[PDB]
Amino acid sequence: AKGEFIRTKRHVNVGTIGHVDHGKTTLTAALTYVAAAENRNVEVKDYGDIDKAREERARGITINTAHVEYETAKRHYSHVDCRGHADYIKNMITGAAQMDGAILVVSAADGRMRQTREHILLARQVGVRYIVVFMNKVDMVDDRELLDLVEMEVRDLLNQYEFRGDEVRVIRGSALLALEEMHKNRKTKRGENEWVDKIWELLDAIDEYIRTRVRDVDKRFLMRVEDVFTITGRGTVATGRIERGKVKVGDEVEIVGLARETRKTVVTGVEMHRKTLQEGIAGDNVGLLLRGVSREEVERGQVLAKRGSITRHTKFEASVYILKKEEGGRHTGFFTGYRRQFYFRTTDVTGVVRLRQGVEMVMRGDNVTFTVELIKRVALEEGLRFAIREGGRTVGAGVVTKILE
RNA sequence: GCGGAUUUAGCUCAGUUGGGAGAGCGCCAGACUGAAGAUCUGGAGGUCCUGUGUUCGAUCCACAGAAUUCGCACCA
RNA sequence: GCGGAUUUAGCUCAGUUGGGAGAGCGCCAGACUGAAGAUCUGGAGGUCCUGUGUUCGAUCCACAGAAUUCGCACCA
């Protein structure tokens, strides 16, 4: 609950990704501050405001993703700040899956590192169509050559995963300095400060290079759950970015995937950053209250859609490679009925394998292809890779080949 | 997620000299007795949890994986 | 390791004329019994601790040894 959400400008989802500690989170807060300075009703957020759970404050790293809101003259933004530690890629993947564009933050003192690559690639397997780069920690370095180098590399890497690395915008800066400045004074405006001004460059880039997508409001409603909460007094809320179509209170929806069968509900709430929306539409990052569903009946990875519109998912075909005893895997074939655990991003769910006809027992080292039916619904997509582990070990590696349900 | 302990016959479990695959109970059979029970005797019964490695040789050693279990870490 | 005692049948033991290898118990069988037990019949049963020696002949005598067992290893 809180104010109403009133559409006055275009909406676009974005976020932060990059190697651990390259400063994604600092930069997130710095964006909040600076935009606020020129557009009041932009509520500012500091680090603690973002990296808020205790371990996050404890170990000093982002662990859960965070949604912050902010805007510019031109547009309104929902921004997901993701963790760069690899133990947490699943989350990063879930946030990146809501972005219409992503800010890839590369620390100039460190240059491209691993998650820098991984994130770019994963960003892609999840739909991010544009990336804008922000070469951070600049204050820490001054050899123009090391700057220029890092830039090349980043571009290159982008090229490798087919982003237009040659054209991608690359802003250099220090978010730590901008943030610090805003702390001394919150009203700094464009031109008042060097560091602060780089963020304006970033903000501009985001405004300019990442185009506003063309949402399909007419297609059947579909919104993939990204999270689920139990809100006091009201009920079960499911958050996510509408893929297409729309919703408003009163509409009944279908919770699809990751479970035996699908369940129906009527949407009784629609918000966007804790603010009422009459009807949310394709591109809104919202939250929906659902009549009757418990926290157990809805979860990340399932999907909200127009009843019957769809076949989160539970079943799918997949091309797999079973590892050799030698590669640390199994040492005995398996057959239909085998149910190990599947891992997609930060998700892990148990599933029953079903060998196609003409295939009876799959042996260690074979490249099979078969169907799996998950014990819970989850956000899938063809081409999505996964790992199969069971009994303490990794037993296979494969990719979604087609969504059964 | 962490970390501990466990995986050996159909059940419950031994098994550390790195070279023999085991005990009990059950399955059957022989002996027995009117007849059975009990006993005794014999037999059949095994991906030593899975894979790769070390080794003249692995149930045993190293490594990765899995299941179960108990303790902790998670919980709008 | 100092000395004595002991070592014969499955068990416990006799065995002194240097010439027969024994008893009791047990064990197996027969008879008897409805069967088993008890009794009667019968049968088997031996590295006389080992070796060597003395002797016409060795459980027996001599030497070496072994094993069991008991006592002994004490005085500034």
CATH number at residue A194: 3.40.50.300
Cα distance between the two ends of chain A: 34
Same domain, A197 and A269: no
Domain boundary at A253, A283, A305, which? Answer: A305
Report the footprint of strand B: residues with C-beta closer than 7 angstroms: A 53, 229-232, 295, 324-332, 340-341, 348, 364, 389-395
Bridge partners of residue A235, in order along the sequence? A231
Q: Is A357 inside a domain boundary?
A: yes
Q: Is A87 helix (H, G, I), strand (E, B) or coil?
A: helix
Number of compact structural domains in chain A: 3
Which CATH number covers residue A257?
A: 2.40.30.10
Same domain, A71 and A203: yes
Question: Can A204 be counted among the known catalytic residues?
Answer: no
Considering all nucleic acid strands, name the nucleotide whose C1' atom is nearest to the C-alpha of residue A332: B50
Q: Is A217 inside a domain boundary?
A: no
Q: Which of A238, A251, A230 is CA-nearest to residue A285? A: A238
CA–CA gap between residue A139 and residue A266 (Å, rounded) = 52
Same domain, A231 and A365: no
Same domain, A187 and A283: no
Q: Is A150 inside a domain boundary?
A: yes
Domain carrying residue A371: 313-403
How many CB atoms neighbour CB A41 within 10 A?
9
Q: Which of A193, A379, A214 is CA-nearest to residue A300? A: A379
- CA of A284 and C1' of C53: distance in angstroms? 121
| Total residues belonging to chain A | 405
Same domain, A110 and A195: yes
Same domain, A201 and A101: yes
Method: cryo-EM
Q: Is A78 helix (H, G, I), strand (E, B) or coil?
A: strand
Same domain, A134 and A25: yes
Say if CB A299 and CB A258 are below 8 A apart: yes
Same domain, A247 and A165: no
**Cα-trace Rg, chain A:** 22
Q: Which of A47, A10, A12 is CA-nearest to residue A28? A: A47
